[PDB]
Write a protein that binds this ligand. Structure first.
Ligand code: BDK
Ligand code: NA
Length: 240
């Protein structure tokens, strides 16, 4: 997250760290959202590689014992049928991961709340992106969970020439675009928490940024619109 501030320990308890094994250690590669005690929602492009993955919940500092983490293995990955590896711009960048075991909920570990199907947010709605990704374009990963205020940019403005044009579809939500704050490498798959009727609900799964850099004026961070996939999600959990 570029332009972020450190998040308090118990602010976004549905956030997870998706790690794969590298050598003898595991390395953070993407974020995610706990939606069931044994189901995580992330970006399809995070789990494309044939790697061994693990989910860490209750995580705050990546390289230090917080005394609140639970480490669970991933036993089933279900990527969206229409996802196309060579195609973040086509969409369907969503994947559900079945955990090997149910995690225990407490104040650092809670389920993120999902929006009703078809729910579209008004322009400039108040949202926060969270994650441990690069803090600067070409920089390094954050050690502690960072958060950044990222108001939405509706489809009309976002698909306009000066913004993303045709690269963005209606099954995606844009947030940010100020040149100061944004998602960045390592935040992929995490939540975009938006406040609707006094409650924060996860409206986007972090997908992509500009090839020029993370914080680019008029190139808001782009997320997969969770409300476009509510039936697919329930259909997967119901049959797995
Ligand atoms: C996300 O964190 C990342 N998303 C992408 O990079 C997706 N993407 C783009 O943003 C652009 N501009 C073009 N293509 C793509 C891709 C297509 C297929 C795979 S990526 C964020 C910018 C939201 C990530 F992709 F998952 C990623 O970068 N994760 C790796 C993080 N590493 C961890 C180790 O240290 C370096 C960063
Ligand atoms: Na930790």
């Amino acid at each position: 997250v570029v332009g972020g501030t450190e998040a308090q320990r118990n602010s976004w308890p549905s956030q997870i760290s998706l790690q794969y094994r590298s050598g003898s250690s595991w390395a953070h590669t993407c974020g995610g959202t706990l939606i069931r005690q044994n189901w995580v929602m992330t970006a399809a492009h995070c789990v494309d590689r044939e790697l061994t993955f693990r989910v860490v919940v209750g995580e705050h500092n990546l390289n230090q014992n917080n005394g609140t983490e639970q480490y669970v293995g991933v036993q089933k990955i279900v990527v969206h049928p229409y996802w196309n590896t060579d195609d973040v711009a086509a969409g369907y960048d969503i994947a559900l991961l079945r955990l090997a075991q149910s995690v225990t909920l407490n104040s650092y570990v809670q389920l993120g709340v999902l929006p009703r199907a078809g729910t579209i947010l008004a322009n400039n709605s108040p949202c926060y992106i969270t994650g441990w990704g690069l803090t600067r374009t070409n920089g390094q990963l954050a050690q502690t969970l960072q958060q950044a205020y990222l108001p939405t940019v509706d489809y009309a403005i976002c698909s306009s020439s000066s913004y993303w044009g045709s690269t963005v579809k209606n099954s995606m939500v844009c947030a940010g675009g100020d040149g100061v704050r944004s998602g960045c490498q390592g935040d992929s798959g995490g939540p975009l928490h938006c406040l609707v009727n006094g409650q924060y609900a996860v409206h986007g799964v972090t997908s992509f940024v500009s090839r020029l850099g993370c914080n680019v004026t008029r190139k808001p961070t782009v997320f997969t619109r969770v409300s476009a996939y509510i039936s697919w999600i329930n259909n997967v959990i119901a049959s797995n």
